[PDB]
Design an enzyme around this catalytic site. Structure first.
Site, PDB file in Angstrom:
ATOM      1  N   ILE A  12       0.844  -1.168   0.000  1.00 39.06           N
ATOM      2  CA  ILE A  12       0.000   0.000   0.000  1.00 39.06           C
ATOM      3  C   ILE A  12       0.906   1.254   0.000  1.00 39.06           C
ATOM      4  O   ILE A  12       2.031   1.222   0.447  1.00 39.06           O
ATOM      5  CB  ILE A  12      -1.013  -0.112   1.163  1.00 39.06           C
ATOM      6  CG1 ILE A  12      -0.309  -0.056   2.520  1.00 39.06           C
ATOM      7  CG2 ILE A  12      -1.801  -1.436   1.047  1.00 39.06           C
ATOM      8  CD1 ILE A  12      -1.227  -0.149   3.696  1.00 39.06           C
ATOM      9  N   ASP A  13       0.470   2.305  -0.651  1.00 38.04           N
ATOM     10  CA  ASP A  13       1.305   3.459  -0.875  1.00 38.04           C
ATOM     11  C   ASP A  13       0.363   4.495  -1.510  1.00 38.04           C
ATOM     12  O   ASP A  13      -0.705   4.147  -1.992  1.00 38.04           O
ATOM     13  CB  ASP A  13       2.514   3.145  -1.828  1.00 38.04           C
ATOM     14  CG  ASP A  13       3.559   4.311  -1.922  1.00 38.04           C
ATOM     15  OD1 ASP A  13       3.437   5.325  -1.158  1.00 38.04           O
ATOM     16  OD2 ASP A  13       4.488   4.243  -2.773  1.00 38.04           O
ATOM     17  N   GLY A  14       0.773   5.755  -1.489  1.00 38.11           N
ATOM     18  CA  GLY A  14       0.005   6.831  -2.064  1.00 38.11           C
ATOM     19  C   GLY A  14      -0.873   7.621  -1.081  1.00 38.11           C
ATOM     20  O   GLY A  14      -1.623   8.463  -1.513  1.00 38.11           O
TER      21      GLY A  14
END
Lengths: 230, 230
Positions: A12-14
């Site tokens: 997960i990222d952003g």
């Protein structure tokens, strides 16, 4: 069917980028991200995936501000006390484990963790692993440490060390599907950032530009259709 | 400059597909692939990259037909006796090493290898590593074996094992840039196929559909421009 992966893992990222773009706080970026998880998990369960791993926190992430990290640990505790409870007690019968260096987490998070593990310990549905304070290098180092201790106590000889033995001392030794078939990473970056390493020799990678707070069940579906085309 | 990677690694792939599409033999696909290498190496050297690794052969590749593998080993010997000689004796002054399980190679290939290593042993230009019979899992296992042997002879205690110590027993311990900054993989597939694992926690990945026999200096340039944009 077999063209459905046994193990799917997600980086997960952003969250910051998404917060930024929406004129909103990172804490709200993170909270909306985490709220997506339960639908992602139910969907993976519905699709017949046997193991879903979500990478919640790296040991490097401990370098962010203390406010940011403390907020995250809280959001994770809310997730475990609220959504995971529902997932593990529902008819999906999900089994919950956490992997990573747990003694680095606050005691309130450690307790939410072992509570959800106890609650789901004998469930028979999809395995859901939350990887928290997990890093791939650290996993390999700790495996090697454990093996080394056993060598020093006569339990193992150097030439008894093979993949299989190495694999049994990794933090993923809680599954028979340690190696993901499919690794998804949101937000556009094409790298591992010290997630699994040993576990990835044949895993298919899928990169989406989608920022994780916008990441839903459809995006998991898109990752699976990519996987089937390969 | 610093926005030029210190270590660039390349997974070559697409030789069969390319042969197929051109109504040609896999042996000719492979030979044209390998002929690209010298220009790739000179170019990396010209760009000021300090280390270029080309992954020539995995331990799984030993599963292909014996004719295919034997042809490859021969093509590799021709490369080392012809092109590498020129590279290491030219003004690029390239230093050559091979990594991998060398005792699995024919003795003629082992000898071409140590000849080119001896010839270039004190050169000061770009390091070029040919990874042959190399696999990431095997590297980690062998590192752990070595560490374990030292533990058993009292030279090391289990809690002395850390990243740095682990890193010194990997086959990449011949470089101070073991970890690639940029990993390029030709032919479209998005996975590692048991190349480096320990070495990749922060490396940027770059995937091109280009089949490797069509892969030239421009494609390396394209990978570098992607890397600079990140």
């Amino acid at each position: 069917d077999e063209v459905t992966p046994n193990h799917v893992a997600i980086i997960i990222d952003g969250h910051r980028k998404w917060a930024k773009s929406r004129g909103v706080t990172v804490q709200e970026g993170h909270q909306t991200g985490v709220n997506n998880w339960k639908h992602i998990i139910s969907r993976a369960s519905q699709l017949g995936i046997k193991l879903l791993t979500i990478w919640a926190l790296s040991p490097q992430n401990f370098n962010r501000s203390k406010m940011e990290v403390d907020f995250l640990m809280r959001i994770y505790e809310d997730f475990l006390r609220s959504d995971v409870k529902e997932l593990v007690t529902s008819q999906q019968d999900i089994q919950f484990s956490a992997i990573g260096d747990k003694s680095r987490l606050p005691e309130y998070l450690q307790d939410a963790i072992s509570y959800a593990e106890g609650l789901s310990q004998a469930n028979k549905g999809m395995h859901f692993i939350l990887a928290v304070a997990y890093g791939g290098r650290e996993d390999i180092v700790e495996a090697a440490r454990k093996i080394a201790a056993k060598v020093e106590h006569g339990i193992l000889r150097p030439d008894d060390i093979d993949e299989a033995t190495f694999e049994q001392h990794l933090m993923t030794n809680i599954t028979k599907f340690p190696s993901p078939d499919l690794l998804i990473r949101a937000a556009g970056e094409q790298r591992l950032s010290n997630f699994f390493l040993w576990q990835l020799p044949f895993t298919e990678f899928y990169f989406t530009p989608k920022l994780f707070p916008d990441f839903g069940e459809a995006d998991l579906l898109d990752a699976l259709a990519s996987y089937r085309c390969r």
